[PDB]
Design a binder for this molecule. Structure first.
Ligand SMILES: NS(=O)(=O)c1cc2c(cc1Cl)N[C@H]([C@H]1C[C@H]3C=C[C@@H]1C3)NS2(=O)=O
Ligand SMILES: NS(=O)(=O)c1cc2c(cc1Cl)N[C@H]([C@H]1C[C@H]3C=C[C@@H]1C3)NS2(=O)=O
Ligand SMILES: NS(=O)(=O)c1cc2c(cc1Cl)N[C@H]([C@H]1C[C@H]3C=C[C@@H]1C3)NS2(=O)=O
Ligand SMILES: NS(=O)(=O)c1cc2c(cc1Cl)N[C@H]([C@H]1C[C@H]3C=C[C@@H]1C3)NS2(=O)=O
Ligand SMILES: NCc1cc2[nH]c(=O)c(=O)[nH]c2cc1[N+](=O)[O-]
Ligand SMILES: NCc1cc2[nH]c(=O)c(=O)[nH]c2cc1[N+](=O)[O-]
Ligand SMILES: NCc1cc2[nH]c(=O)c(=O)[nH]c2cc1[N+](=O)[O-]
Ligand SMILES: NCc1cc2[nH]c(=O)c(=O)[nH]c2cc1[N+](=O)[O-]
Lengths: 256, 256, 256, 256
């Protein structure tokens, strides 16, 4: 039986090809996650079909009806057999599905207009503003923080005029590019570097990751693909395959 | 029942108390892993007894007799119920034992005396020598690496005189401090930062991580502790506790 | 029973929530004294309701009818059970009501626009004018002062033109910000620091405190709350809670 | 009946006169506390006899025997009717004896040789050393402290070579004087100022008080001298008498 691989459209993980309208099957898509799916299938030996999640969400549960949307919902309700996507490994998600070892390491990073080379410097000064997404995991991390630096950041951002929070990541990047060095954006390190390697190459990632997270390949609880996929990720990590794929899709196809 | 925790003596993970002669039980030890064990036991609501691994080794499979030693041996042969230590998540270990999600991220870094800011700069120049251990993860990573930069680094190291390889990290740091800016050490980033934060403060860490690894909490295969321990690790990571413990034993206790 | 906690509307002690219309009860208020009331009630384990004093006055005795107004009136005439507010510990108030040990220390300081580093520096020179409230504790302190510096300051202020006395605190701060370094304001050190930590940040605090005063928690005479409240104040001061609460509402929420 | 006033020999509060062996009665002693006792007696209209505490201690429980020593024990066991001394208002003492409102404000301050202004700066730099007494309430303040600055200074102090903690305060000021700018002393603000005003006038108090404490007049619990002495202290504070006595014994009799 062929294995359904649910995933999401997000550059450079999964992207729609230039000549995709004429293509069919798995050839309509390309990216880091497509190559990762190919490597996992080669390691384990199964035939797979790539499918994009219908609602285009990573996955969350509502306190009202206790239902999961997105790829986590697709996994828990039997619609998909495996999720190969930039899905963050969280406790709430891990309670309902099985996560492999993280195949990519990320964290919260600072985006500026290409000095302030760390988070504490940005917190101290008020000359350069900084913002976060209007609603997201990074925003909740800032909200529920204990360290003094992040507490000061959150007290500043929550009570600030104009609203430094931004609806969507694209609007935040646009704000950073417009503000001619006045506004800094806080976001995931992987997306930060991806945008930094995009035209017109006017943004730069500065400093280190504020926290540490990871992306995992998720399977339903009690699935037969859990253990073999976990060993596949570890094998690809020690072989340097995962390092090669990140270099290819972030830098070899970069534009700077 | 009292769960036996197998552990190795490593700084700042598990060091002897300054007055361990006047103490008995788990009060004899302190460090990062002692606090981690305390929090893991608090989450799962059980009592434990810390035990230092007698062989003093992390764990590997014998080439001929196929017998594991170290904490991996203790878990495989039922001499312990958990291994709360900086145990690297690898493939063969994952095949014999169970690993949790990585509670700390590490990679190969460069140690220089307090001109070189990256591995590319290190490879291009020949003024400064550099090497790794005589045998271990770093040397095997450089031996099998197909990437051009690390391939060039390895072919330099193999054909360099005097020999750039050292017998143990202690003599590696010693040779770094004695060469007076004429030697770089390729070691784990955690040990790099720790030695950086020690007196007399004559070493620094340059560049990013060459690869990416992780330390995980090990548990015997088929144990009932694996899932609660994994959830405890995820909860501690999301609450910022692991952020605090790393900063405490690396920077707050630092002498620089 | 429910304990009535009379309070005054003063910043940053008790101020309205940014969206107090949507809220009700004790969640409708915020500030230093709200947190202090929460901790005091937690120590003594009682239920409380925050009520703003209707007259909007701290409390004084009428020289004609000998009737107290404000929160001192509420405590004397049995309209409240406790007064958790910046109430100054004075002689007549101590004669009518009971005060705890001072939970915060304050004095008379100098407010200048961001040449003078002490009160005697103000006294010796004449270029910069300075004054106090037209009616209040500071003017009376300067009036009946036998110390040479304070006596010289007072005899300058009395025989000065244009008049150096302001109607209220807001007018004094405004006159400080409308003189371009040609006017100094003599006010309480707590209000000095507060206005210093607010936008547009064009005022500073120079020199030490001219005298010593304290804010105390006031309880009705012959009540069972006095001794536990005094012990609670002492315990909170010894634990550093009072140090933290001032830092939060003065500096951690500052705008400079 | 004459009132017994227990005191402690401590400059400038209580001191022995140059011609004391010739004199008898209350004339054997002079200082800030002697003048304060005179003012309190005049306000309350009683005659008093000044006595020095036999063991020369302020007061502390001995946990094994549960017996108070010093002037606190003198008051508890009926030996003395009032204590007029630099007795800190603490939680443990307040439960057992009665304290008036504080007549003097003090705190922990930094003593240098006349570089660094504030305590956070001292914490950051490791060039200048600093340490408190081998015992006393300053170490207890530092240990219980949860703020990052004071906690990090405490962790520096605990693990420090050579031992920066000092046996006695005189040895501490001697070490500061001999250290020629290398060692800073942390102690009470009042004693800091007193030593600053004495020959050879080489030490200087710098920065601000780290915490806030106070000295109070102590009376046995449930005694008729409580409220009158409290009112006397308040009246003397509002009359400026306490300011005058502080100036007289710290500066008017200073030597710098
Ligand atoms: N450089 S990267 O973000 O593409 C990246 C990140 C990571 C990789 C591999 C790569 Cl290539 N493997 C590690 C894995 C190895 C073992 C230790 C942690 C997991 C299990 N996780 S990681 O630290 O999240
Ligand atoms: N010691 S550390 O600050 O570098 C550090 C490192 C890591 C942390 C948490 C911390 Cl505090 N959690 C992550 C975990 C979170 C979820 C995603 C990857 C694992 C599962 N692993 S990690 O990337 O190895
Ligand atoms: N830093 S502050 O003004 O908020 C402040 C001021 C003071 C505090 C505590 C704080 Cl946090 N406690 C002291 C108390 C402690 C004991 C000695 C005097 C009173 C009883 N009073 S204080 O010296 O008036
Ligand atoms: N300048 S000083 O240390 O001699 C000093 C310190 C203080 C004085 C008076 C003087 Cl002179 N009175 C105040 C008192 C006044 C009222 C408010 C707090 C107590 C009751 N306490 S204090 O703030 O501890
Ligand atoms: N960077 C990819 C990406 C991955 C995500 N994974 C998640 O589990 C999630 O809850 N939100 C994410 C947002 C993004 N994003 O668009 O920044
Ligand atoms: N704690 C550092 C450290 C951790 C290790 N963990 C392992 O699982 C391992 O096989 N070898 C290690 C060597 C070292 N080392 O000596 O740098
Ligand atoms: N700083 C708070 C503040 C506290 C006060 N307490 C009093 O007991 C009082 O009689 N007058 C006060 C004025 C002020 N003020 O300056 O607004
Ligand atoms: N008068 C100063 C002083 C006053 C003190 N009051 C106290 O209640 C105490 O327990 N210890 C003290 C030590 C000192 N000291 O540093 O000599």
């Amino acid at each position: 039986k062929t294995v359904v691989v649910t995933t999401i459209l997000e550059s450079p993980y999964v992207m729609m090809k230039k000549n995709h309208e004429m293509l069919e099957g798995n050839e309509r898509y390309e990216g880091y996650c497509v190559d990762l799916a190919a490597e996992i299938a080669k390691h384990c030996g199964f035939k797979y079909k790539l499918t994009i999640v219908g609602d285009g969400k990573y996955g969350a549960r509502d306190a009202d009806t206790k239902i999961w949307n997105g790829m986590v919902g697709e996994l828990v309700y039997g619609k998909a057999d495996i999720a190969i996507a930039p899905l963050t490994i969280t406790l709430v998600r891990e309670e309902v599905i099985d996560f492999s070892k993280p195949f990519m390491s990320l964290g919260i990073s600072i985006m500026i207009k290409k000095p302030i080379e760390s988070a504490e410097d940005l917190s101290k000064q008020t000359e350069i503003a900084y913002g976060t997404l209007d609603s997201g995991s990074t925003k909740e991390f800032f909200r529920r923080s204990k360290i003094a630096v992040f507490d000061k950041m959150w007290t500043y951002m929550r009570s600030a005029e104009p609203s430094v929070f931004v609806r969507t990541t694209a609007e935040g990047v646009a704000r950073v590019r417009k503000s001619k060095g006045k506004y800094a954006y806080l976001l995931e390190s992987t997306m930060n570097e991806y945008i930094e390697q995009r035209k017109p190459c006017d943004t730069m990632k500065v400093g280190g990751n504020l926290d540490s997270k990871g992306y995992g390949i998720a399977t339903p609880k009690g699935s037969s693909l859990g253990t073999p996929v976990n060993l596949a990720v570890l094998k690809l990590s020690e072989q340097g395959v995962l390092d090669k794929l990140k270099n290819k899709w972030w830098y070899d196809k970069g534009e700077c």
